[PDB]
Write a protein that binds this DNA or RNA. Structure first.
Ligand code: MG
Ligand code: MG
Ligand code: MG
Ligand code: MG
Ligand code: MG
Ligand code: MG
Ligand code: MG
Ligand code: MG
Ligand code: MG
Ligand code: MG
Ligand code: MG
Ligand code: MG
Ligand code: MG
Ligand code: MG
Ligand code: MG
Ligand code: MG
Ligand code: MG
Ligand code: MG
Ligand code: MG
Ligand code: MG
Ligand code: MG
Ligand code: MG
Ligand code: MG
Ligand code: MG
Ligand code: MG
Ligand code: MG
Lengths: 116, 99, 251, 72, 308, 158
RNA sequence: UUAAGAGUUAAACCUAGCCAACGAUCCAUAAUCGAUAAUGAAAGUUAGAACGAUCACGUUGACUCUGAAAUAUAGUCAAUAUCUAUAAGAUACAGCAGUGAGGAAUAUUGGACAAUGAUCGAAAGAUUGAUCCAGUUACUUAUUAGGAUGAUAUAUAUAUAUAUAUAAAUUGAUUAAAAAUAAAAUCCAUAAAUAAUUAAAAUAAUGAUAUUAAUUACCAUAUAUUUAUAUGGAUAUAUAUAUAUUUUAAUAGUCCUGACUAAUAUUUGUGCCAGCAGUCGCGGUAACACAAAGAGGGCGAGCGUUAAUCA
């Protein structure tokens, strides 16, 4: 992307079983090097859904753990998030459609909901 | 769903001609059927015989056609006439002295 | 001092005499046959004490020390039968007083050597149904029923779950005649119990999207995979777990 | 006792005991030397590995074949 | 895991987690574990040998050492703390199946799990090393449990021979009753401790020759008809279930029929709930084991130091 | 593996969390008072004495703490545009939206950090005050015991 | 001179100081460390491969430009070593593969940018031996690598301890001497295959891995809460429809048995030889120790041994 400070994903885990840390990192450091901060974790594999649960209508869930207060701070100071991180932040409501792209973008089946 | 063939690109033959990168050799694979080209995913194009690069490029351009984005040939990057940057110095020294 | 000690019976038994050269037998096999008794054409050993299960709600556990190795009784009259020099089974000379005088605790002791091991009492179906009614229908807590029936809370909850599952299976006619027979038989083999916050964002979902993101609030300095953490993949302390589907995954 | 002087690749010259009932070691032979002294031979602090290099395994070995290079 | 090899050897006299007839004899004749005249190492080795023969024999030694927990859990008589040496193995799925009387042995429980016949809280589990937590519900396919606890299904030939013998003995009894009903009635009443039509009611049964009857099951099913055994071959009332079809318990089931204290079992459904990890209380240990406390003490001393 | 016992048995390291406010804020009265308080005089203190001279090129006193003013930091770091009025631009709307979100995020972060620091200061004040009243409690307790003074001399008092 | 202190460097002038037996100076050796690995009860001790942090280096030495920062994998000069283009030339694989040597010993002259990053571009997109995958290698760790039943063959004639006969019966041995429920045989399974289907890694689209994982053994739907009975497309048959509805296993080494140190059922060959051995030690007819047979005891896809580390 651009800028010295970038919010990106650093790959942790094992071969064929990826997990990621959402990290604020210097652009010139390695992908898996120790970052400025570790804002969260991201599991790209959706939760398994049973056939009966498919009949129920439940949808697979992808799990992200994130520090929302600190991520907002890093966005404020000028940190530039990667494309995948940009998508992850947009689905969380941290970023709005202004960060979208022509290729990305439709009917809403479920609206973003905030509950403790 | 199937986009409707345009006068600019009437047939899958013309589509393969335009997208380029030696995709013209795949004319027999599709048999000049718009429906097959615009419903055939990557697994089918694999079992037909299309190589990885060709099927990926064709799916990319098919998606572009669905979204009406230009589908002209994107010529792949090529190393410079004087060689790669690491080999540029030696090749330039040879070329200058020889000619 | 230590040496290999072939596990001969501690009780007296009839050792092999002079053998025809082709018998190729062992004292252990003869002891096993004496303990087992004659075998039927059907393959059974009716003479043995323990061949047939009990049905009087009192278990029949081995008592080699009390009976001194004599484990053959008449299948019907259930009177002791000892081997005799003629080769036949016959009444013993003097009946073992130990077998009539058996402590109540020892009857529930499965293994002669270990006294601390004891079988558990089996709850009656009526008591299980009463617990189900008390918990689910009358809305009683597990504490109150556990105190009422001298039971433990995890057992009460397990009974509730099991009675619900039994009701479902009976609804679907899954319980069969063979299953009923097996349950009934194992019921009479055992003694019967006697009653007396973190902010969470669920993401927007759009048509065609196969998954919905769930975002959990976390604190920096505590959220993330640590850098330089120990690798136990090639160590005996390797960490293994099981997926929600039930497959095995390395953690 | 069957033993042999051996010059190793690092330049040291040692005396190595040759285990087994029979051996075909000879001068110029390539051998592999491991630790372990011959107790009753003073100055012999090393053993030769049977079945490695130019030294063959013990002939007609049945027990402890791995310790003597025999294959079966 | 280890390959099952000489698990029932009478000479060695080891006791296994199984309902075998040979295992029953080995347990019966064992008496106790002899620790006299032995050095401390010999005592520890004997205790290890016996207890590992019973507890988790199929596990490799290094795997058990890794799984071994040097701590023990407990909740007037003396509490046998050290009977909990092998309590860690009791949370394993196969051990839970065996202790729930859903398998004849831990090996059979392992096979049942590996073949997809076992579920834990409604999800199929195919790994015997799976460990249960308190409150976990597990269940077995009813046919597998019936096979494990039921008697062996005879083959057609063997049951045909048994039916030949049964017909023969019935004919002998009928002849004896018809010829001298007096003494037969007298013997019947004595064993329990007149109308001549009774002896008339008894009917002979046609003798059967298996040479012509071999290879045809329905023919034999229709031909054989005894007052107890009507219209089926011995033990094959419905030759499509994996067990002796008129269901009777397997032989020698009562010696090993032990109800666990940490599992709650429903045999109608072949379900069970893992209440807790086994614990030691005054005068009792919930870890079922055929060895007394000193044997487990010596095994624990062995495995604390890895046999040092 | 051993050293992890110190750190809660957690293996691996996170990067050190950065402080949003590099220097103390001007609303932290206690820090300013400690900074402004008279320095302890002499050797158990921290400063040069009255008579003693310092080296020619050195500074007698350390640099004074720069107390951030959150309002000033917000004003200088993120300033609202003066020219509110503008016409339609395809990228201008997107840039304006991103700038507004970034300004809001940074302002919110700074203000919440200052409030958090003040809240910790108040919490410490409550803790210390409660401990001092706890000392007053044992003062109350002891006088009950020594209200029983026969004014003879005891050995425990000796 | 620097942005900046200081004998850091350069110049000048003064003072006689500074370190050191609690070890200076000199020499040898060494990349350093962790919330990393090993070990121990622990203090500690060892390693610094793997994960992570710092430093230094990119064939060797010095200097210079640019720059915020370089004595830069840059440039210049020289040293070493090669190639041609014979030039005020080029290259130095401690980048990925790979080759030769050295060594006891450490692999592919692989696929893809599908994912995560990086560079260029306004974008479209382009590049990417970073990276991700696969290959080799038991180097290490984990799960599987089949359970129950089972000591013999024939012949006789609502009860049930069926009893008689004959015949056989491998190695060892003549009874506490066994091998051995070990085999065979029987029962029941699953893996693999063969068929269908089929996620997820990734979505706006793009999948190298890939002959994907997983599910079912004909296929759907229609209700119940995985197991049921139904309706419809399969299905050969016999004569639309009573019927069934792919097949199916089993596969272990290596060390040791005098004591330390678990291994009793005993024999044979040798004869202070051959040999074994971690320590004591054994071997001269009577070898529990050597080489073997039987039996037995450990660990087990590993076992042993050597080299090391800790205790
Ligand atoms: Mg750009
Ligand atoms: Mg171009
Ligand atoms: Mg011994
Ligand atoms: Mg100066
Ligand atoms: Mg100096
Ligand atoms: Mg000077
Ligand atoms: Mg010195
Ligand atoms: Mg060095
Ligand atoms: Mg170095
Ligand atoms: Mg390292
Ligand atoms: Mg060091
Ligand atoms: Mg390396
Ligand atoms: Mg350098
Ligand atoms: Mg250099
Ligand atoms: Mg080099
Ligand atoms: Mg290389
Ligand atoms: Mg070499
Ligand atoms: Mg890429
Ligand atoms: Mg490549
Ligand atoms: Mg013989
Ligand atoms: Mg030897
Ligand atoms: Mg001899
Ligand atoms: Mg020895
Ligand atoms: Mg020997
Ligand atoms: Mg042998
Ligand atoms: Mg292994």
């Amino acid at each position: 992307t651009c800028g010295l400070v970038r919010i990106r994903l650093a790959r942790f885990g094992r071969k064929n079983s990826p997990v990621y840390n959402i990290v604020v990192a210097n652009s010139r450091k390695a992908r898996d090097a120790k970052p400025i901060e570790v804002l969260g974790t991201y599991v790209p594999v959706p939760s398994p859904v049973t056939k009966r649960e498919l009949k129920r209508g439940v949808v697979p869930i992808k799990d992200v753990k994130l520090d929302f207060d600190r991520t907002k701070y890093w966005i404020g100071v000028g940190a530039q998030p990667s494309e995948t991180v940009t998508k992850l932040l947009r689905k969380a409501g941290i970023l709005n459609d202004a960060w979208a792209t022509s290729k990305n973008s439709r009917k809403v089946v479920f609206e973003r909901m905030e509950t403790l | 769903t199937i986009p409707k063939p345009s006068d600019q690109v009437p047939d899958v033959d013309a589509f393969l001609n335009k997208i380029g990168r030696n995709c013209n050799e795949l004319k027999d694979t599709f048999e000049n059927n718009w429906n097959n080209l615009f419903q055939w995913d990557s697994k089918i194009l694999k079992e037909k015989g299309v190589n990885i690069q060709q099927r990926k490029y064709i799916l990319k351009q098919v998606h572009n056609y669905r979204n009406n984005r230009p589908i002209h040939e994107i010529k792949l990057g090529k190393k410079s006439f004087f060689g790669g940057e690491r080999k540029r110095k030696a090749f330039t020294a040879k070329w200058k002295a020889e000619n | 001092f230590s040496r290999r000690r072939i596990a001969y019976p501690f009780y007296p038994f009839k050792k092999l005499g002079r053998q025809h050269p082709k018998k190729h037998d062992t004292n252990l096999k003869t002891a096993m046959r004496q303990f087992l008794g004659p075998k039927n054409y059907k393959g059974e050993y009716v003479m043995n004490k323990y061949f047939t299960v009990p049905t009087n709600h009192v278990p029949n556990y081995i008592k080699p020390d009390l009976e001194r190795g004599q484990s053959l009784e008449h299948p019907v009259t259930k009177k002791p039968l000892q081997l005799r020099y003629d080769g036949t089974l016959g009444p013993p000379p003097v009946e073992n007083k130990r077998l009539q005088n058996i402590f109540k605790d020892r009857l529930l002791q499965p293994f002669p050597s270990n006294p601390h091991c004891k079988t558990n009492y089996v709850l009656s179906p009526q008591l299980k149904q009463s617990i189900f009614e008390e918990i689910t229908v009358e809305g009683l807590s597990a504490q109150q029923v556990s105190q009422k029936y001298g039971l433990k809370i995890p057992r009460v909850e397990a009974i509730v779950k099991l009675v619900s599952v039994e009701n479902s299976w009976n609804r679907r006619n899954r319980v069969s005649s063979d299953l009923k027979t097996m349950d009934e038989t194992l019921y009479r083999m055992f003694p019967v119990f006697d009653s007396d916050n973190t902010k969470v964002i669920y993401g927007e979902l759009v048509e065609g999207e196969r998954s919905q993101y769930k975002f959990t609030n976390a604190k920096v300095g505590k959220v993330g995979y640590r850098y330089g953490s120990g690798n136990r993949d090639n160590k005996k302390d390797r960490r293994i777990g099981f997926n929600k589907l039930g497959q095995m995954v390395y953690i | 006792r069957k033993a042999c002087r051996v010059r190793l690749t690092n330049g040291n010259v040692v005396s190595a005991y040759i285990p087994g009932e029979g051996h075909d070691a000879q001068e110029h032979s390539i051998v592999y030397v491991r630790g372990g002294r011959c107790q009753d031979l003073p100055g012999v602090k090393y053993h030769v590995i049977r079945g490695a290099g130019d030294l063959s395994g013990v002939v007609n070995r049945i027990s402890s074949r791995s310790k003597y290079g025999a294959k079966k | 895991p280890r390959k099952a090899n000489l698990l029932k050897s009478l000479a060695r006299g080891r006791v296994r987690t199984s309902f075998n007839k040979y295992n029953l004899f080995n347990l019966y004749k064992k008496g106790g574990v002899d620790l006299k005249s032995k050095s401390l190492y010999q005592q520890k080795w004997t205790a290890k040998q016996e207890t590992r023969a019973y507890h988790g024999e199929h596990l490799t030694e290094k795997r058990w050492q890794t799984v071994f927990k040097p701590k023990l859990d407990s909740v007037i008589k003396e509490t046998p703390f050290l009977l909990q040496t092998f309590a860690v193995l009791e949370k394993r799925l196969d051990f839970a199946l065996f202790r729930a009387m859903f398998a004849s042995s831990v090996r059979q429980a392992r096979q049942f799990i590996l073949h997809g016949n076992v579920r834990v809280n409604g999800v199929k589990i195919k790994h015997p090393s799976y460990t249960l937590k308190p409150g976990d519900m597990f269940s077995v396919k009813p046919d597998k449990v019936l096979e494990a606890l039921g008697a062996k299904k005879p083959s057609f030939q063997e049951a045909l021979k048994i039916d030949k013998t049964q017909i023969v003995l019935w004919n002998k009894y009928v002849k004896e009753a018809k010829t001298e009903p007096k003494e037969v009635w007298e013997k019947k009443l004595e064993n329990f401790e007149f109308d001549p039509k009774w002896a008339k009611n008894l009917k002979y049964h046609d003798p059967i020759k298996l040479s012509e009857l071999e290879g045809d099951e329905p023919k034999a099913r229709k031909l054989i008809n005894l007052p107890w055994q009507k219209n089926y071959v011995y033990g094959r009332q419905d030759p499509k279930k994996p067990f002796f079809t008129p269901w009777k318990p397997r032989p020698f089931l009562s010696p090993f029929a032990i109800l666990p204290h940490h599992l709650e079992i429903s045999f109608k459904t072949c379900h069970a709930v893992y209440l807790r990890d086994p614990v030691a209380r005054p005068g009792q240990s919930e870890v079922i084991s055929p060895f007394d406390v000193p044997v487990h003490e010596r095994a624990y001393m062995y495995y604390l130091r890895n046999g040092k | 593996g051993k050293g992890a016992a110190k750190y809660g048995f957690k293996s691996g390291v996170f990067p050190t969390t950065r402080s949003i406010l590099k220097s103390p804020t001007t609303k932290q009265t206690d820090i300013i008072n400690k900074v402004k308080s008279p320095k302890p005089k002499g050797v158990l203190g921290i400063g040069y004495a009255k008579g003693v001279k310092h080296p020619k090129g050195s500074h007698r006193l350390s640099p004074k703490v720069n107390f951030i003013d959150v309002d000033n930091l917000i004003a200088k770091t993120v300033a609202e545009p003066q020219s509110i009025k503008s016409s339609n631009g395809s990228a201008q709307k997107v840039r304006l939206q991103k700038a507004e979100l970034r300004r809001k995020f940074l302002i919110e972060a700074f203000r919440k950090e200052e409030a958090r620091l003040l809240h910790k200061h108040e919490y410490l004040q409550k803790r210390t005050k409660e401990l001092e009243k706890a000392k007053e409690l044992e003062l109350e307790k002891l006088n009950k015991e020594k209200s029983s003074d026969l004014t003879i001399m005891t050995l425990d008092k000796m």
